[PDB]
Design a protein around this ligand. Structure first.
Ligand code: B7R
Length: 270
């Protein structure tokens, strides 16, 4: 990774200009700014606990390199290769007027995200903050898992971290297990199918994971929730992705499939 000076990063972002269209958005623990180097567009995340998360991000990126993981370019502030299509969260909501993702693109993105998580778990890493805001999309809409500041290389902690609407029950109690990442990925799969955010305070139900119970109790069907901003979805593949999401969202962690099984199920879907 390249060691950048703070004044270099200050200059490439127009003194960290907070106005939107150098401000691109708000990342996990700071603001993300658009920058340039040698004609390459980059993303600059300007951030004791925070220093440890900065170090963890560098350490995990040093060990983990995969097509479905973001690429860290350097640090001072963390510098990444700019992902032209932003986050899956924003593309699902069509933020800034971007066109809705097709069912075909959604399947590829789901497969890519699972391949990324599989790579992290094979390398004995638990992400701990799997969510659609942490799935970035490059120039070809390839899914890239981001934000390894909370990553860790059964087991409990006193500092419970993560995003509540995506968290497994045992993660909310303090457990650290790769099974919690599977549960969070199940919520992401529901966001892909429905186009709905994981939590909406002005919606009933507020939490997206609650639709699993509505479908099981036959109060609603998966068809009632399928994103209407698609013209190419088919019941068979949608139902197969919902079946993976349902398995991931099992309340008992040991009943959930491992990431290799999730990856297999998503491959058989297409
Ligand atoms: C209409 N059109 C306008 C421009 C737009 N757009 C492109 C982008 N690119 C973009 N955004 C990011 N962050 C946000 C999602 C903005 C919050 C990041 C990012 O956070 N990291 C990152 C941070 N920490 C750890 N690992 C990776 C790396 C790359 C990256 N790249 C944003 N918006 C697309 C739609």
């Amino acid at each position: 990774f390249h060691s950048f000076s703070f004044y270099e990063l200050k200059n490439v972002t127009n003194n960290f200009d907070e106005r939107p269209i150098n401000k691109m958005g708000e990342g996990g623990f700071g603001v993300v700014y658009k920058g340039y180097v040698n004609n390459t567009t980059v993303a600059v995340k300007k951030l004791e606990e925070l220093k440890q998360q900065f170090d963890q991000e560098i350490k995990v990126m040093a060990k983990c390199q995969h097509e479905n993981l973001v690429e860290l370019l350097g640090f001072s502030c963390l510098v990444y290769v700019y992902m032209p299509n932003g986050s899956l969260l924003d593309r699902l909501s069509c933020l800034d007027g971007t066109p809705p993702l097709s069912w075909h693109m959604r399947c590829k993105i789901a497969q890519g995200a699972a391949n990324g998580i599989n790579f992290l778990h094979e390398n004995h890493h638990i992400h701990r903050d799997i969510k659609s805001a942490n799935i970035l999309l490059d120039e070809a809409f390839t899914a890239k898992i981001s934000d390894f500041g909370l990553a860790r290389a059964t087991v409990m902690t006193s500092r419970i971290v993560g995003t509540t609407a995506y968290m497994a029950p045992e993660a909310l109690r303090g457990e650290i297990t790769p099974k919690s990442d599977i549960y969070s990925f199940g919520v992401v799969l529901l966001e892909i199918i429905t186009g709905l955010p994981a939590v909406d305070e002005h919606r009933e139900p507020q939490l997206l994971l609650d639709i699993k119970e509505e479908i099981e109790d036959e109060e609603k069907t998966i068809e009632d929730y399928i994103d209407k901003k698609m013209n190419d979805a088919d019941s068979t593949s949608v139902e197969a992705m919902y079946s993976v999401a349902s398995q991931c969202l099992h309340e008992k962690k040991n009943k959930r499939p491992d990431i290799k099984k999730v990856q297999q199920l998503l491959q058989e879907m297409t």
